[PDB]
Amino acid sequence: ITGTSTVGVGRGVLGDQKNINTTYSTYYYLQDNTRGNGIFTYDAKYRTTLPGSLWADADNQFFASYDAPAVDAHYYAGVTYDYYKNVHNRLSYDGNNAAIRSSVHYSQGYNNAFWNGSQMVYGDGDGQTFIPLSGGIDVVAHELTHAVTDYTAGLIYQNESGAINEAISDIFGTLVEFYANKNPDWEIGEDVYTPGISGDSLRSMSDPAKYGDPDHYSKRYTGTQDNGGVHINSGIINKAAYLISQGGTHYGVSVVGIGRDKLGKIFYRALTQYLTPTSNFSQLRAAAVQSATDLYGSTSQEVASVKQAFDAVGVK
Protein backbone atom coordinates (compact mmCIF):
# COMPACT_ATOMS: atom_id res chain seq x y z
CA ILE A 1 0.00 0.00 0.00
CA THR A 2 0.99 3.65 -0.42
CA GLY A 3 1.52 5.62 2.76
CA THR A 4 3.94 7.00 5.29
CA SER A 5 6.90 4.99 6.57
CA THR A 6 7.03 4.78 10.34
CA VAL A 7 8.15 2.58 13.22
CA GLY A 8 5.96 0.52 15.51
CA VAL A 9 6.69 -1.53 18.59
CA GLY A 10 5.65 -5.05 19.52
CA ARG A 11 6.43 -8.29 21.30
CA GLY A 12 7.72 -11.40 19.56
CA VAL A 13 6.87 -15.07 20.11
CA LEU A 14 9.44 -15.46 22.91
CA GLY A 15 8.13 -12.37 24.73
CA ASP A 16 10.95 -10.03 23.67
CA GLN A 17 10.21 -6.40 22.74
CA LYS A 18 11.30 -5.03 19.35
CA ASN A 19 10.81 -2.16 16.89
CA ILE A 20 9.36 -2.92 13.48
CA ASN A 21 9.11 -0.93 10.27
CA THR A 22 5.49 -0.24 9.38
CA THR A 23 3.52 1.84 6.90
CA TYR A 24 0.75 4.24 7.85
CA SER A 25 -2.33 4.86 5.77
CA THR A 26 -5.50 4.96 7.91
CA TYR A 27 -4.19 1.75 9.46
CA TYR A 28 -0.62 0.78 10.31
CA TYR A 29 0.45 -2.07 8.04
CA LEU A 30 3.27 -4.57 8.38
CA GLN A 31 5.04 -3.20 5.37
CA ASP A 32 8.70 -2.26 5.61
CA ASN A 33 9.69 0.21 2.88
CA THR A 34 13.29 0.56 4.06
CA ARG A 35 14.52 -2.70 2.46
CA GLY A 36 14.49 -3.24 -1.31
CA ASN A 37 10.99 -3.22 -2.80
CA GLY A 38 9.67 -4.01 0.66
CA ILE A 39 8.93 -6.61 3.30
CA PHE A 40 5.23 -7.50 3.61
CA THR A 41 3.60 -9.60 6.28
CA TYR A 42 0.17 -11.17 5.94
CA ASP A 43 -2.50 -12.67 8.17
CA ALA A 44 -3.68 -16.06 6.84
CA LYS A 45 -6.31 -16.13 9.63
CA TYR A 46 -6.03 -19.91 10.32
CA ARG A 47 -6.89 -20.72 6.70
CA THR A 48 -4.74 -22.19 3.94
CA THR A 49 -5.49 -19.66 1.20
CA LEU A 50 -2.51 -17.42 0.51
CA PRO A 51 -1.25 -14.83 1.10
CA GLY A 52 -4.24 -13.69 3.16
CA SER A 53 -4.63 -10.05 4.21
CA LEU A 54 -1.81 -7.52 4.53
CA TRP A 55 -1.45 -7.18 8.30
CA ALA A 56 -3.34 -4.06 9.49
CA ASP A 57 -3.18 -2.61 12.99
CA ALA A 58 -5.09 0.34 14.47
CA ASP A 59 -2.44 1.85 16.74
CA ASN A 60 1.09 0.76 15.58
CA GLN A 61 1.49 -1.29 18.78
CA PHE A 62 1.77 -5.06 18.44
CA PHE A 63 1.51 -6.61 21.92
CA ALA A 64 -1.45 -8.96 21.45
CA SER A 65 -0.49 -12.63 21.58
CA TYR A 66 -2.14 -12.93 18.15
CA ASP A 67 0.39 -10.33 16.94
CA ALA A 68 3.55 -12.14 18.08
CA PRO A 69 4.22 -14.41 15.08
CA ALA A 70 3.62 -11.50 12.71
CA VAL A 71 6.11 -9.35 14.62
CA ASP A 72 8.87 -11.95 14.37
CA ALA A 73 8.23 -12.97 10.76
CA HIS A 74 8.38 -9.30 9.76
CA TYR A 75 11.38 -8.51 11.95
CA TYR A 76 13.46 -11.58 11.13
CA ALA A 77 12.83 -11.24 7.39
CA GLY A 78 14.39 -7.79 7.79
CA VAL A 79 17.43 -9.17 9.61
CA THR A 80 17.88 -11.88 6.97
CA TYR A 81 17.71 -9.26 4.21
CA ASP A 82 20.38 -7.21 6.03
CA TYR A 83 22.62 -10.26 6.37
CA TYR A 84 22.56 -11.04 2.65
CA LYS A 85 22.99 -7.39 1.67
CA ASN A 86 25.71 -6.49 4.17
CA VAL A 87 27.74 -9.69 4.12
CA HIS A 88 27.24 -11.06 0.56
CA ASN A 89 26.31 -7.92 -1.41
CA ARG A 90 23.05 -9.59 -2.46
CA LEU A 91 19.89 -7.53 -2.79
CA SER A 92 17.00 -9.73 -1.63
CA TYR A 93 16.64 -13.33 -2.75
CA ASP A 94 16.66 -12.64 -6.48
CA GLY A 95 19.56 -10.19 -6.33
CA ASN A 96 17.26 -7.46 -7.66
CA ASN A 97 15.51 -6.41 -4.43
CA ALA A 98 12.36 -8.54 -4.86
CA ALA A 99 9.64 -7.90 -2.26
CA ILE A 100 9.71 -10.39 0.58
CA ARG A 101 6.29 -11.72 1.60
CA SER A 102 5.31 -13.86 4.60
CA SER A 103 2.01 -15.17 5.86
CA VAL A 104 1.53 -16.23 9.47
CA HIS A 105 -1.30 -18.07 11.28
CA TYR A 106 -1.36 -20.54 8.38
CA SER A 107 -3.96 -23.28 8.96
CA GLN A 108 -4.61 -24.68 12.46
CA GLY A 109 -2.01 -26.35 14.66
CA TYR A 110 0.35 -26.50 11.70
CA ASN A 111 3.83 -27.74 12.72
CA ASN A 112 5.84 -26.38 9.83
CA ALA A 113 7.06 -23.43 7.85
CA PHE A 114 8.00 -23.27 4.19
CA TRP A 115 8.92 -21.29 1.10
CA ASN A 116 6.32 -22.11 -1.56
CA GLY A 117 8.10 -20.66 -4.60
CA SER A 118 6.60 -17.17 -4.05
CA GLN A 119 6.49 -16.41 -0.33
CA MET A 120 7.13 -17.67 3.16
CA VAL A 121 4.44 -19.39 5.19
CA TYR A 122 4.50 -20.02 8.97
CA GLY A 123 2.30 -22.28 11.06
CA ASP A 124 1.49 -21.59 14.70
CA GLY A 125 2.48 -25.08 15.81
CA ASP A 126 0.23 -27.15 18.06
CA GLY A 127 1.71 -25.75 21.26
CA GLN A 128 3.41 -29.05 22.11
CA THR A 129 5.76 -29.92 19.26
CA PHE A 130 6.14 -26.27 18.14
CA ILE A 131 5.23 -22.75 19.15
CA PRO A 132 4.78 -20.29 16.23
CA LEU A 133 7.62 -21.03 13.86
CA SER A 134 8.58 -17.47 12.99
CA GLY A 135 9.89 -17.10 16.55
CA GLY A 136 13.03 -18.90 15.39
CA ILE A 137 15.44 -16.69 13.51
CA ASP A 138 17.25 -19.77 12.18
CA VAL A 139 13.86 -21.05 10.91
CA VAL A 140 13.05 -17.75 9.13
CA ALA A 141 16.53 -17.52 7.58
CA HIS A 142 16.41 -21.21 6.59
CA GLU A 143 13.18 -20.66 4.64
CA LEU A 144 14.25 -17.39 3.02
CA THR A 145 17.49 -19.08 1.93
CA HIS A 146 15.38 -21.57 -0.06
CA ALA A 147 14.35 -18.55 -2.13
CA VAL A 148 18.00 -17.63 -2.70
CA THR A 149 18.76 -21.20 -3.74
CA ASP A 150 15.73 -21.24 -6.05
CA TYR A 151 17.04 -18.19 -7.93
CA THR A 152 20.67 -19.33 -8.12
CA ALA A 153 21.73 -23.00 -8.21
CA GLY A 154 18.11 -24.22 -8.44
CA LEU A 155 18.83 -27.47 -6.57
CA ILE A 156 16.07 -30.00 -7.26
CA TYR A 157 14.23 -30.85 -4.04
CA GLN A 158 15.08 -34.53 -4.31
CA ASN A 159 17.76 -37.07 -3.32
CA GLU A 160 21.28 -35.64 -2.96
CA SER A 161 20.48 -32.32 -4.68
CA GLY A 162 17.65 -31.84 -2.20
CA ALA A 163 19.86 -32.72 0.76
CA ILE A 164 22.31 -30.03 -0.36
CA ASN A 165 19.41 -27.62 -0.79
CA GLU A 166 18.36 -28.39 2.81
CA ALA A 167 21.87 -28.12 4.21
CA ILE A 168 22.44 -24.76 2.50
CA SER A 169 19.35 -23.45 4.29
CA ASP A 170 20.51 -24.83 7.66
CA ILE A 171 23.98 -23.32 7.12
CA PHE A 172 22.82 -19.83 6.27
CA GLY A 173 20.03 -20.05 8.83
CA THR A 174 22.72 -20.63 11.44
CA LEU A 175 24.99 -17.94 10.01
CA VAL A 176 22.11 -15.45 10.23
CA GLU A 177 21.49 -16.53 13.81
CA PHE A 178 25.14 -15.75 14.57
CA TYR A 179 24.90 -12.47 12.67
CA ALA A 180 22.05 -11.18 14.84
CA ASN A 181 23.87 -12.59 17.87
CA LYS A 182 20.69 -14.03 19.35
CA ASN A 183 21.89 -16.91 21.54
CA PRO A 184 23.77 -18.42 18.59
CA ASP A 185 24.47 -22.15 18.34
CA TRP A 186 24.85 -24.90 15.70
CA GLU A 187 21.39 -26.32 16.36
CA ILE A 188 18.29 -25.85 14.20
CA GLY A 189 14.96 -24.64 15.55
CA GLU A 190 15.76 -24.80 19.25
CA ASP A 191 13.84 -21.59 20.07
CA VAL A 192 10.46 -22.89 18.89
CA TYR A 193 10.77 -26.65 19.13
CA THR A 194 9.14 -28.49 22.10
CA PRO A 195 8.48 -25.65 24.58
CA GLY A 196 8.07 -28.35 27.23
CA ILE A 197 11.64 -29.64 26.81
CA SER A 198 14.84 -27.69 27.37
CA GLY A 199 18.07 -28.27 25.47
CA ASP A 200 16.75 -30.05 22.36
CA SER A 201 16.22 -29.02 18.74
CA LEU A 202 15.04 -30.30 15.36
CA ARG A 203 18.51 -30.99 13.94
CA SER A 204 22.09 -30.51 15.06
CA MET A 205 24.91 -29.42 12.78
CA SER A 206 27.64 -30.04 15.35
CA ASP A 207 26.39 -33.59 16.00
CA PRO A 208 23.62 -34.68 13.58
CA ALA A 209 23.57 -38.23 15.00
CA LYS A 210 22.25 -36.79 18.26
CA TYR A 211 18.81 -37.03 16.62
CA GLY A 212 19.43 -39.96 14.30
CA ASP A 213 20.71 -38.17 11.19
CA PRO A 214 23.83 -39.44 9.35
CA ASP A 215 27.14 -37.71 10.07
CA HIS A 216 28.96 -39.76 7.44
CA TYR A 217 28.30 -40.61 3.80
CA SER A 218 28.39 -44.35 4.53
CA LYS A 219 25.36 -43.86 6.75
CA ARG A 220 23.30 -42.05 4.12
CA TYR A 221 19.62 -42.83 3.71
CA THR A 222 18.87 -44.50 0.38
CA GLY A 223 15.10 -45.02 0.65
CA THR A 224 12.22 -42.96 -0.71
CA GLN A 225 10.79 -41.13 2.33
CA ASP A 226 11.25 -37.39 2.74
CA ASN A 227 11.90 -37.08 -1.01
CA GLY A 228 14.82 -39.47 -0.73
CA GLY A 229 15.97 -38.13 2.64
CA VAL A 230 16.45 -34.43 2.00
CA HIS A 231 16.07 -33.55 5.71
CA ILE A 232 18.03 -36.67 6.72
CA ASN A 233 21.15 -36.68 4.52
CA SER A 234 21.61 -32.96 4.96
CA GLY A 235 23.22 -34.03 8.24
CA ILE A 236 26.23 -35.19 6.25
CA ILE A 237 26.68 -31.76 4.66
CA ASN A 238 25.80 -29.89 7.87
CA LYS A 239 28.56 -31.75 9.74
CA ALA A 240 31.09 -30.91 7.01
CA ALA A 241 30.19 -27.22 7.27
CA TYR A 242 30.39 -27.35 11.05
CA LEU A 243 33.86 -28.87 10.72
CA ILE A 244 35.06 -26.25 8.20
CA SER A 245 34.04 -23.47 10.58
CA GLN A 246 34.89 -24.87 14.02
CA GLY A 247 37.30 -27.72 13.32
CA GLY A 248 37.57 -31.01 15.17
CA THR A 249 38.35 -34.67 14.64
CA HIS A 250 35.63 -36.82 13.10
CA TYR A 251 35.98 -40.55 12.45
CA GLY A 252 39.72 -40.14 12.91
CA VAL A 253 40.10 -37.29 10.42
CA SER A 254 41.33 -33.95 11.78
CA VAL A 255 40.12 -30.57 10.52
CA VAL A 256 41.44 -27.11 11.30
CA GLY A 257 38.57 -24.65 11.65
CA ILE A 258 38.74 -21.48 9.54
CA GLY A 259 35.74 -19.74 11.11
CA ARG A 260 32.16 -18.71 10.26
CA ASP A 261 32.92 -15.74 8.01
CA LYS A 262 34.99 -17.79 5.58
CA LEU A 263 32.52 -20.69 5.74
CA GLY A 264 29.84 -18.27 4.59
CA LYS A 265 31.94 -16.83 1.78
CA ILE A 266 32.96 -20.23 0.45
CA PHE A 267 29.47 -21.68 0.44
CA TYR A 268 27.87 -18.51 -0.92
CA ARG A 269 30.28 -18.59 -3.87
CA ALA A 270 29.72 -22.30 -4.46
CA LEU A 271 25.96 -21.71 -4.39
CA THR A 272 25.97 -18.78 -6.80
CA GLN A 273 28.80 -19.70 -9.20
CA TYR A 274 29.23 -23.47 -9.39
CA LEU A 275 26.26 -25.50 -8.15
CA THR A 276 23.59 -26.68 -10.63
CA PRO A 277 20.06 -28.08 -10.22
CA THR A 278 21.34 -31.69 -10.29
CA SER A 279 24.56 -31.32 -8.25
CA ASN A 280 25.29 -34.27 -5.96
CA PHE A 281 27.50 -34.40 -2.82
CA SER A 282 30.66 -35.10 -4.80
CA GLN A 283 29.98 -32.08 -7.00
CA LEU A 284 29.37 -29.96 -3.90
CA ARG A 285 32.84 -30.92 -2.67
CA ALA A 286 34.34 -29.84 -5.98
CA ALA A 287 32.39 -26.55 -5.99
CA ALA A 288 33.51 -25.77 -2.42
CA VAL A 289 37.14 -26.64 -3.08
CA GLN A 290 37.04 -24.47 -6.21
CA SER A 291 35.35 -21.58 -4.37
CA ALA A 292 37.94 -21.59 -1.57
CA THR A 293 40.65 -21.78 -4.28
CA ASP A 294 39.15 -18.73 -5.98
CA LEU A 295 39.07 -16.84 -2.71
CA TYR A 296 42.23 -17.90 -0.87
CA GLY A 297 44.53 -19.72 -3.30
CA SER A 298 45.10 -23.39 -4.07
CA THR A 299 47.69 -23.91 -1.32
CA SER A 300 45.80 -22.00 1.36
CA GLN A 301 44.79 -23.46 4.74
CA GLU A 302 41.20 -22.76 3.67
CA VAL A 303 41.33 -25.15 0.70
CA ALA A 304 43.03 -27.73 2.94
CA SER A 305 40.30 -27.48 5.60
CA VAL A 306 37.49 -27.81 3.07
CA LYS A 307 39.19 -30.98 1.80
CA GLN A 308 39.71 -32.46 5.29
CA ALA A 309 36.09 -31.77 6.28
CA PHE A 310 34.62 -33.56 3.27
CA ASP A 311 37.17 -36.36 3.78
CA ALA A 312 35.95 -36.59 7.39
CA VAL A 313 32.32 -37.19 6.34
CA GLY A 314 33.33 -39.55 3.55
CA VAL A 315 32.50 -37.37 0.56
CA LYS A 316 35.03 -37.81 -2.24
Residue 202 one-letter amino acid: L
Q: State the nearest-atom distance from the C-beta of 114 to Zn ion, in Å.
A: 7
Query: Which residue in 143, 160, 250, 302 is the catalytic one?
Result: 143
CA angle 259, 262, 263 (to 5 degrees): 80
In 44-99, which ranges are E strands?
Answer: 53-54, 56-57, 61-62
Q: State the nearest-atom distance from the C-beta of 265 to Ca ion, in Å.
A: 20
Sign, CA dihedral 232-236-242-247, equals: positive
Q: State the nearest-atom distance from the C-beta of 190 to Ca ion, in Å.
A: 5
Q: How far apart are CA 248 and CA 237, in angstroms?
A: 15
**Does position 174 bind Zn ion by CB under 5 A?**
no
Flag whether 302 is marked binding.
no
Taking CB atoms, the residue at the shortest distance from Ca ion is: 194
Quick count: other Cβ atoms within 10 Å of Cβ 110? 21
Nearest by Cα to 14 from 110, 112, 131: 131
What phi, psi does 26 have (nearest 5°)?
Answer: 65, -60
Flag whether 308 is marked binding.
no
Flag whether 74 is marked binding.
no
Flag whether 67 is marked binding.
no
Nearest by Cα to 282 from 163, 173, 170, 157: 163
Binding site residues, Ca ion, CB under 5 A: 57, 59, 61, 138, 177, 183, 185, 187, 193-194, 197, 200
Nearest by Cα to 189 from 142, 225, 150: 142
CA angle 61, 64, 68 (to 5 degrees): 90
Q: Choose the contact partner of 59 out of Ca ion, Zn ion, none; CB within 5 to 8 A by kind.
A: Ca ion
Site residue total, Zn ion (CB under 5 A)? 1
Query: Which residue in 160, 231, 250, 302 is the catalytic one?
Result: 231
Q: State the nearest-atom distance from the C-beta of 213 to Zn ion, in Å.
A: 14
Sign, CA dihedral 252-285-151-49, equals: negative
Flag whether 32 is marked binding.
no
Q: State the nearest-atom distance from the C-beta of 157 to Zn ion, in Å.
A: 9
Instruction: Output 114 or 151, the one with its CB closest to Ca ion.
Output: 114
Q: Is 160 a catalytic residue?
A: no
Binding range to Zn ion, per CB under 5 A, among 12-20, 83-91, 161-169, 179-187: 161-169
**Does position 169 bind Zn ion by CB under 5 A?**
yes
Q: Is 250 a catalytic residue?
A: no
Site for Zn ion in 129-158 (CB under 5 A): none
Q: How far apart are CA 263 and CA 246, in angstroms?
A: 10
Quick one: the chain helix, strand, coil %, rounded to 5?
40, 20, 40
Instruction: Output 83 or 193, the one with its CB closest to Ca ion.
Output: 193
Annotated binding site for Zn(2+): 142, 146, 166
Annotated binding site: 57, 59, 61, 138, 142, 146, 166, 177, 183, 185, 187, 190, 194, 197, 200
Contacting residues toward Zn ion, per CB under 5 A: 169
Which residues carry out catalysis?
A: 143, 231
